[PDB]
């Protein structure tokens, strides 16, 4: 492990001797540093899958148009016609944050990268929460937030010529809004996390079930730095893609968003998403 914290680089990951990596060792590195780069791995699809199985329980994405043609577990973001889906993740989110079991870990392998300006922005939601005074934290504790993904589900090739209301209705059954505690506690690190997302968090309600003042959700979102279109907030870390360098991170603690670029060429990334078996997203706080 070269550095410490978000950009930490890890050098010994050999795609033909993955049996040397144990689950507890890679998990502890990820929990501690939150975002790590497995440098110069360049795995095949099957070696990637082996590494994913080391990390945790691989969950395939629910929508098969994202699947790798040969490996349903691999979520494919690619500008190649008919390969996965182009330009995914162009908005702040947590992977599967709208689903019954959000992922513990996300893992992205960049396969083709044009230029050197694309990657992912990350925000540490535990550091945001720890930054807030107790009086500001108090309206958020013991509440439930609603996360509505539906407006961000993408039109699929098989949706062409469907009435949009029927596509919407199908989305509403597949990915209905869901409620999570506004503040959660990481089941492993003990860290409290402000689990809110400008893209999908619509409201906060208290233990009675009453609406909390809309000014509370708005203030907290602003505090995360998710509402600055110029990405200058101190809480934003920028991680640039590099071919073969695998990006692996804690999907409970980090909110992220695609960073786009200007260079011509194919952008192709493969993603594996894993549960760790612990309370997800976390314990209520
Ligand atoms: C709660 C915020 C809604 C996020 C919409 C989810 C669509 C994305 C895929 C894509 O960006 O096309 N989901 C990926 C995942 O959750 O792992
Ligand atoms: Fe994502």
CATH architecture: 4-Layer Sandwich
Output the helix-strand order: EHEHEEEEHHEHEEEEHEEEEE
CATH class division: Alpha Beta
* Gap from first CA to last CA: 32 Å
Fourth-level CATH superfamily? Clavaminate synthase-like
Helical content stands at 10-25%
Strand content: 15-25%
Unique bound compounds: (3R)-3-(2-hydroxy-2-oxoethylamino)decanoic acid, fe (ii) ion
Describe the sheet with the most strands.
Answer: 7 strands, mixed
Principal-axes shape call: globular
Structural class: alpha+beta
Instruction: Give the number of domains.
Output: 1
Radius of gyration, in Å, reads 19 Å
The CATH topology annotation reads as Double-stranded beta-helix
Number of strands: 16
Total helical segments: 6
Short key terms for the protein model shown above:
monomer; 285 residues; alpha+beta; Double-stranded beta-helix; seven-stranded mixed β-sheet; three-stranded antiparallel β-sheet; 6 helices; 16 strands; globular; binds (3R)-3-(2-hydroxy-2-oxoethylamino)decanoic acid; binds fe (ii) ion; oxidoreductase; MmaE; Fe/2OG enzymes; monomeric; Putative dioxygenase
């Amino acid at each position: 492990v070269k550095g410490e914290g978000l950009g930490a680089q890890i050098t010994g990951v050999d795609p033909k001797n993955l049996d040397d990596i144990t689950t507890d060792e890679i998990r502890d590195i990820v929990y501690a540093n939150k975002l790590v780069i497995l440098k110069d791995v360049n795995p095949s699809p099957e070696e990637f899958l082996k590494l994913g199985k080391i990390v945790g329980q691989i969950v395939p994405y629910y929508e098969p148009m994202y699947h790798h043609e040969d490996h349903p577990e691999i979520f494919v973001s690619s500008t190649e016609e008919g390969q996965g889906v182009p330009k995914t993740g162009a908005f702040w989110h947590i992977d599967y944050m709208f689903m019954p079991e959000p992922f513990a870990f996300s893992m992205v392998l960049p396969l083709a990268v044009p230029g050197h300006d694309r990657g992912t922005y990350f925000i540490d939601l535990a550091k945001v929460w720890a930054s807030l005074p107790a009086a500001q934290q108090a309206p958020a504790r013991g509440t439930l937030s609603t996360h509505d993904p539906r407006r961000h589900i993408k039109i699929r090739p098989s949706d062409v010529y469907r009435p949009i209301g029927e596509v919407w209705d199908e989305i509403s059954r597949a990915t209905p809004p869901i409620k999570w505690p506004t503040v959660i506690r990481h089941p492993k690190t003990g860290e409290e996390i402000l689990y809110i997302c400008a893209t999908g968090t619509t409201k906060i309600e208290d233990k009675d079930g009453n609406l909390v003042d809309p000014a509370v959700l708005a203030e907290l979102l602003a505090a995360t730095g998710q509402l600055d279109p110029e990405y200058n907030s101190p809480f934003i870390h920028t991680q640039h893609y590099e071919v073969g360098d695998i990006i692996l991170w804690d999907n409970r603690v980090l909110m992220h968003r695609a960073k786009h670029g200007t260079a011509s060429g194919t952008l192709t990334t493969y993603r594996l998403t894993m549960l760790d078996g612990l309370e997800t997203p976390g314990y209520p706080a």
